[PDB]
Amino acid sequence: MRTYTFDQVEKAIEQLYPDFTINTIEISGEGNDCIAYEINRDFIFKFPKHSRGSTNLFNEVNILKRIHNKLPLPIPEVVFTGMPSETYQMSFAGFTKIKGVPLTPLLLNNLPKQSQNQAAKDLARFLSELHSINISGFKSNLVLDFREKINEDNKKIKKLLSRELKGPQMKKVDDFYRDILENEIYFKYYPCLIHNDFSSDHILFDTEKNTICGIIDFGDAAISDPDNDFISLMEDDEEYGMEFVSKILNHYKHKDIPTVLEKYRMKEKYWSFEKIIYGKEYGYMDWYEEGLNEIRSIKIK
């Protein structure tokens, strides 16, 4: 992973946009892929920590352009873009800053009921529109076929762990994957554009009006199961929990809530495997070793 000096950030931007005066530059936050810099309190510029992150940033730029002006909450607008090199598909990008603070579960549960309900309705409406966007222009690098993802994961896990697990432990890994694969419910969805990291840290809130004022972080958006964007809201402490999320599902007119729950339960168990792979694909040994220990020692449905 690479980090950046403030000077490097300013030089990179100067190279392609020499007429843009930078007065203020501060780190705004940081995810798996990118470090974010707030520039002139007007813009957020993302700089990739690594190649994989850069490809995600390239995709985020492409998606945000394709959906500009289509959705009923504000989303970042692409204003500046960097260049490809032998290392990065895109060396940086600058988006409009969306104002607001994350709608944390704490903040949400302290709102008056009327604003909680309005927030659930505004989310459903946003997701209905997002999930309705015409996907036919989106190439295969943006398509995340869940069955292919599960089979490809099964193969990455075997390749990574065949020297790390004993016989019965790998047996339990095969039983687990066989069980998921034989359940049709995970695989029969109508593919749609999904945010795919749809959680409270990415939902921005205006406390003067008590209304959601933006959705951010599209670097994982992909063509996939629309249910992914309800399950990412559901974790009982970390996120909103079921009472709130069923108001979103009801506003969205979801026809099959129990399927949403079943997907959520499966994704809870699936986390150990995600941790191994993420471990290696994003260079986080801590996750790797945590996921390995869980496969080694603990029951998995």
Ligand X SMILES: Nc1ncnc2c1ncn2[C@@H]1O[C@H](CO)[C@@H](O)[C@H]1O
Q: Of residues 22, 111, 133, 266, which one binds Cl ion by CB under 5 A? A: 133
**C-beta of 258: minimal distance to Cl ion in Å?**
30
> How far apart are the C-alpha atoms of 49 and 130, rounded to whole Å?
28
49 binding ligand X? (CB under 6 A): no
261 interacts with, out of ligand X, Cl ion, none, CB within 5 to 8 A per kind: none
The label of the residue with tokens 């419910």 reads 185
Q: Of residues 114, 134, 136, 297, which one binds Cl ion by CB under 5 A? A: 134
Structure tokens at 166: 């004993």
> How far apart are the C-alpha atoms of 217 and 184, rounded to whole Å?
30
Q: Which of 37, 20, 44 is nearest to 98 (CA)?
A: 44
Phi then psi for residue 100, to 5 deg, are 115, 175
201 binding ligand X? (CB under 6 A): yes
64 and 203 Cβ atoms separated by less than 8 Å? no
* Residue 46 annotated as lining a ligand binding site: yes
Stretch that binds ligand X, among 2-10, 28-36, 123-131, 189-197 (CB under 6 A): 28-36
> How far apart are the C-alpha atoms of 141 and 60, rounded to whole Å?
12
Size of the site for Cl ion (CB under 5 A): 2
Angle ∠(12,15,18) on CA atoms, nearest 5? 120
The label of the residue with tokens 């390239």 reads 58
> How far apart are the C-alpha atoms of 295 and 138, rounded to whole Å?
36
217 interacts with, out of ligand X, Cl ion, none, CB within 5 to 8 A per kind: ligand X
Expressed in angstroms, the distance from the first to the final Cα of the chain is: 35
Stretch that binds Cl ion, among 2-10, 130-138, 244-252, 266-274 (CB under 5 A): 130-138
CA within 13 Å, CB half, 122 = 19
Q: Of residues 10, 17, 22, 29, which one binds ligand X by CB under 6 A? A: 29
**C-beta of 135: minimal distance to Cl ion in Å?**
8
221 binding ligand X? (CB under 6 A): no
> How far apart are the C-alpha atoms of 183 and 188, rounded to whole Å?
10
* Residue 96 annotated as lining a ligand binding site: yes
**C-beta of 201: minimal distance to ligand X in Å?**
5
Cβ nearer to ligand X, comparing 30 with 294: 30
Stretch that binds ligand X, among 22-30, 55-63, 117-125, 289-297 (CB under 6 A): 22-30
Q: What single DSSP character describes residue 140?
A: G
Structure tokens at 201: 């840290």
Amino acid at 160: L
45 interacts with, out of ligand X, Cl ion, none, CB within 5 to 8 A per kind: none
Handedness of CA 247, 248, 251, 252 (dihedral sign): negative
Stretch that binds ligand X, among 65-73, 93-101, 146-154, 163-171 (CB under 6 A): 93-101
97 binding ligand X? (CB under 6 A): yes
67 binding Cl ion? (CB under 5 A): no
Structure tokens at 182: 């034989």
Residue list for the binding site: 33-34, 46, 96, 98, 202, 217, 220
Write out the residues near Cl ion by the rule CB under 5 A. Answer: 133-134
Write out the residues near ligand X by the rule CB under 6 A. Answer: 28-31, 36, 44, 76, 95, 97-98, 201, 216-217
